[PDB]
Design a protein around this nucleic acid. Structure first.
Ligand SMILES: [Zn+2]
Ligand SMILES: [Zn+2]
Ligand SMILES: [Zn+2]
Length: 81
DNA sequence: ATATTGGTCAAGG
DNA sequence: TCCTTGACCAATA
């Protein structure tokens, strides 16, 4: 059948889209990255985020790998300024 | 301009 | 039939 969001009243034809959407109300983020503190509500978002980890540049303080050097540079300023 | 991300949507495996 | 997957678009911590 169909289902409706208990928080905002939005109706969903695909019930799995409600499961993901509801997490935007509850703050639930069950998909956690093993290579950084990233956490998301949608499994395929973690798959996408993983491409940013890995050719590969590695932070020499926290050992975190990065595919794009500029993303590593931003990681330096945020965690090791 | 770029890289990355949250919310959205549904094709198709 | 239905959940997984990933493309699309707008926003940027
Ligand atoms: Zn809602
Ligand atoms: Zn990560
Ligand atoms: Zn680091």
């Amino acid at each position: 059948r169909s289902d409706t969001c208990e928080y905002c009243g939005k109706v969903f034809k695909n019930c799995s889209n409600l499961t993901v959407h509801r997490r935007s109300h509850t703050g639930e983020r069950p998909y956690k990255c093993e290579l950084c503190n990233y956490a998301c509500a949608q499994s395929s978002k973690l798959t996408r985020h993983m491409k940013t980890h890995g050719d590969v540049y590695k932070c020499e303080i926290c050992k975190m790998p990065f595919s794009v050097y500029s993303t590593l540079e931003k990681h330096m300023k945020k965690w090791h300024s």
